[PDB]
Each structure stands twice: as structure tokens, then as C-alpha cells.
Write a protein that binds this ligand. Structure first.
Ligand SMILES: CC(C)(Oc1ccc([C@@H]2CC2(Cl)Cl)cc1)C(=O)O
Ligand SMILES: CC(C)(Oc1ccc([C@@H]2CC2(Cl)Cl)cc1)C(=O)O
Length: 273
């Protein structure tokens, strides 16, 4: 129907609580850091090569242990960014268990849904820690400027800017964590992924989440009448954004002998698009 019964309201709260439990950086926390109203101690700003190398003095143990300290600056940056993606994949994998029906799926279908869904979710949630000038890193303790990322040498300067472009329009929708949690659940449940076995079952799982998403958006943002259709379009945009990101990763991986794709991320991108 069009009214939120108790089972739907409970489902929405369960997804929201799993989102808060599994993702350390939520939008409320990110925006207070980015706003600077709860503290006069801002994140360390990485805006050029000098401040990058300053920040990396704190990270020396991790860079040394990973054999990255002497790699080119661009490679060092996106090695750390890869490690962050790996953490978020792990968190999304645990989050998906809270989606009613997900754990009941064939294990191969769970793997397929997460394979194609995680980076759409990652770039959706990445918007929460982005403003027009840069993005929070290191659990909100650092802030790497958008211009410094564009200043990197090709093709590394082409990686993050499309994600900033998406985030600025996504953030204009003014979603809160309760919306984003259901949006991320809907992303994970897409029944259109390549190689899914039990499509019918997955589509019924997806329909339940998307129904709760619509009713929740209508209740939580009553003045933005078509916010739900707007978000359906954002899901399509994310699929295109990830398709292009994966293609660019393949190009870079093949023409950059000293940059290494993280093993876990290797399997994700393997035969993706
Ligand atoms: C603190 C650490 C290593 O996370 C990081 C560290 C560095 C970065 C990137 C390079 C800048 Cl600083 Cl732009 C992102 C996440 C961690 O996960 O423990
Ligand atoms: C957002 C992020 C970090 O993008 C990248 C960017 C660069 C790389 C590294 C250099 C090769 Cl291409 Cl080996 C892998 C992934 C990701 O996909 O997790």
C-alpha cells in the first residue's frame, strides 16, 4: 500500500541501525567535521605534495609494511584509498546480512550482488564525506583537496573528479543517514546483476526494500515530492559511474607497472564490466 505498517517501519529501523553499526563514518559525523562548529581543531589538510609527505610521516609504519613508502606519490595516495575501499567492502558485507532475505540467498548470488553493488554503495556513501573543496580521509582526521587530486599526473587526476561531480548533485538532495541506509540496501539488492541465479527471489527481496525506501522518503522528505524517482535515477548514474571507474582501473592497471591492484579488489573488478 501507501502507508507504513509496523513491519515496514521496523524494517527501516533495522536497516538504519545496521548502517550506523557497520560504517564508522556516517553523514551526521562527517558534516559536523566539515562544518567546524563542534571543534576548532580541523582535519589536517592535504593540498599539495609537501602536506602529503607531512601526512605520510604519520603513516610511515603502514607504508613501510606494505612496501609503498618509495612508490610514486600518486601510487601512495591510491594505495591508501584502496585500503579504505577494502574496509568499506568488509563493512558492506556485514551490513548486507541485515537485509531481510540476503543471507538466505545462494552463496553465489550473495557474492554476485556484493561484487557489483559495493562500489555503487561506496561512491554513494563517499558523498557524505565530500564537499565542493575536498574529501575527508583517515576516519575524518584528514582532508584532501579536490584541486590537489586534479593536480596529480594523468591518469591519476581523472579518478576522483567524477566522484566529486556525482557527490555534489547527490548531496543537493539533502538525504540523512536513515535515507542513505535504505538507498544502500536497495543498491545491494539489484536483481539485474550479471550472472544472478535466482533472479525471481532477488527481485522480491529488492521490491520489499524499494517499497520501504519510497514510503520512508515520502514521510521523511514530504516536500520533495519526486525524491524517490530522483534516487532511482541516481542509482542508474551510480551504475554508469562504476562501469567507467572499473574501465579506468583496468587501463591504469595495465599501463602503470608500479601500481598494484589490491588482491581483494582484484577479484571484485575481475570480469565485472
Ligand atoms: C590512517 C589509515 C592508514 O587510513 C588512511 C591514510 C591515508 C589516506 C590518504 C593519503 C591521504 Cl592522507 Cl590523502 C586515506 C586513509 C588507516 O586506515 O589506518
Ligand atoms: C576508489 C578506488 C581507490 O579507485 C582506485 C584508484 C587507483 C587504483 C590502482 C592504481 C591501480 Cl589502477 Cl593498480 C585502484 C582503485 C577503488 O576502486 O577502490
Amino acid at each position: 500500500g501507501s502507508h507504513m505498517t509496523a513491519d515496514l517501519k521496523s524494517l527501516a529501523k533495522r536497516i538504519y541501525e545496521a548502517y550506523l553499526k557497520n560504517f564508522n563514518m556516517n553523514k551526521v559525523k562527517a558534516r559536523v567535521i566539515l562544518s567546524g562548529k563542534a571543534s576548532n581543531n580541523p582535519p589536517f589538510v592535504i593540498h599539495d605534495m609537501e602536506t602529503l609527505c607531512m601526512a605520510e610521516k604519520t603513516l610511515v609504519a603502514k607504508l613501510v609494511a606494505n612496501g609503498i613508502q618509495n612508490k610514486e606519490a600518486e601510487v601512495r595516495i591510491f594505495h591508501c584509498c584502496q585500503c579504505t575501499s577494502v574496509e568499506t567492502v568488509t563493512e558492506l558485507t556485514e551490513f548486507a546480512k541485515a537485509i531481510p532475505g540476503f543471507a538466505n540467498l545462494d552463496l553465489n548470488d550473495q557474492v554476485t550482488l556484493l561484487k557489483y553493488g559495493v562500489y555503487e554503495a561506496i561512491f554513494a556513501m563517499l558523498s557524505s564525506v565530500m564537499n565542493k573543496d575536498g574529501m575527508l580521509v583517515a576516519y575524518g582526521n584528514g582532508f584532501i583537496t579536490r584541486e590537489f587530486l586534479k593536480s596529480l599526473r594523468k591518469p591519476f587526476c581523472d579518478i576522483m573528479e567524477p566522484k566529486f561531480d556525482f557527490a555534489m548533485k547527490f548531496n543537493a538532495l539533502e538525504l540523512d543517514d536513515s535515507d542513505i541506509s535504505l538507498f544502500v540496501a536497495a543498491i545491494i539488492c539489484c536483481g539485474d546483476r550479471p550472472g544472478l541465479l535466482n533472479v525471481g527471489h532477488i527481485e522480491k527481496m529488492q521490491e520489499g526494500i524499494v517499497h520501504v525506501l519510497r514510503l520512508h522518503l515520502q514521510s521523511n522528505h514530504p516536500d520533495d515530492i519526486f525524491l524517490f524517482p530522483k534516487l532511482l535515477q541516481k542509482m542508474a548514474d551510480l551504475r554508469q559511474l562504476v562501469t567507467e571507474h572499473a574501465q579506468l582501473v583496468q587501463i591504469i592497471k595495465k599501463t602503470e607497472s608500479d601500481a598494484a591492484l589490491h588482491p581483494l579488489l582484484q577479484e571484485i573488478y575481475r570480469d565485472m564490466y
